[PDB]
């Protein structure tokens, strides 16, 4: 689990969004596994606006942060699950690293700020949904 809080927005994995997230929906995209809802309280996370391919992510299943090299956001095949059929998930960045299902929501950060959130994994890989292209998160 996990979310990004920036301005009056909350960014979560779309498959983990709550009833409250859907009742205050701003934008959602199944192809990206992202949902943004509106908040009452002001958020203070900074979003990275860069092309970094290295950063640090939080891994809940190990209670630890790990440094990773990751691919640029792209279309990646994701196997069927209880939330989606087999599909290409867009804006996804992959890295070699540990992840388990409950790791979704962990933040990936570079020196400029928040890059994305854990969204996929398995077989020694971890995939992050990018948020750096969502320029409207700051306005
Ligand atoms: C293996 C799980 C997994 C983890 C994270 C993401 C996706 C998978 C499924 S994959 O491994 O088949 N694969 C990752 C590399 C790019 C492949 C492709 N798109 O042709 C899809
Ligand atoms: C960090 C996740 C993870 C790690 C290791 C094993 C399994 C997972 C979960 S998953 O990658 O199979 N996943 C199920 C939920 C919806 C996700 C999506 N973005 O479509 C895909
Ligand atoms: Zn950066």
């Amino acid at each position: 689990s996990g979310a990004i809080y920036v301005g009056n927005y909350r960014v979560v994995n779309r498959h983990l969004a709550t009833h409250n997230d859907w009742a205050n929906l701003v934008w959602e995209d199944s192809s990206r596994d992202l949902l943004v809802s509106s908040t009452t309280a002001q958020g203070c996370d900074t979003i990275a606006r860069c092309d970094c391919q290295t950063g640090v992510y939080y891994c809940s299943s190990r209670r630890k942060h790990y440094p990773v090299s990751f691919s640029k956001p792209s279309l990646i095949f994701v196997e069927a699950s209880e939330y989606y059929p087999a599909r290409y998930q867009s804006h996804l960045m992959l890295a070699v690293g540990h992840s388990e299902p409950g790791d979704c929501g962990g933040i990936l950060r570079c020196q400029h700020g928040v890059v994305g959130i854990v969204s996929t994994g398995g077989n020694g890989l971890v995939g992050f949904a990018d948020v750096r292209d969502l320029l409207w998160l700051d306005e």
Side-chain angles (χ1 to χ4, degrees):
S1 57
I4 307 166
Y5 293 94
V6 47
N8 290 290
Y9 296 128
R10 160 170 144 106
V11 190
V12 296
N13 292 93
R14 190 189 182 273
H15 73 273
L16 297 183
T18 68
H19 297 302
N20 187 74
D21 284 323
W22 274 102
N24 291 287
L25 179 67
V26 170
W27 169 82
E28 53 78 29
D29 187 333
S30 304
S31 72
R32 293 179 70 155
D33 186 42
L34 290 179
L35 184 145
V36 178
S37 62
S38 64
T39 75
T40 57
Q42 218 64 44
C44 58
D45 290 329
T46 284
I47 310 297
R49 309 295 185 189
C50 65
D51 67 356
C52 285
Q53 281 188 251
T54 66
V56 174
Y57 77 104
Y58 180 68
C59 175
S60 192
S61 63
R62 292 289 180 271
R63 287 185 194 130
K64 274 182 187 57
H65 298 259
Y66 293 113
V68 277
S69 285
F70 53 92
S71 63
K72 287 184 176 181
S74 80
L75 278 164
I76 288 164
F77 183 74
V78 177
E79 343 222 17
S81 75
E82 357 185 299
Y83 311 99
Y84 306 108
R87 82 213 204 281
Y88 277 89
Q89 172 163 330
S90 61
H91 297 268
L92 188 58
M93 299 172 292
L94 291 189
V96 173
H98 182 67
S99 66
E100 292 177 48
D103 288 327
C104 285
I107 286 172
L108 170 68
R109 300 179 78 95
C110 65
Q111 64 186 114
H112 311 102
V114 175
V115 173
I117 53 170
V118 175
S119 176
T120 66
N123 294 336
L125 305 177
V126 55
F128 307 100
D130 187 50
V131 298
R132 297 176 287 184
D133 65 316
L134 305 169
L135 315 183
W136 54 270
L137 282 176
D138 295 304
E139 57 230 33

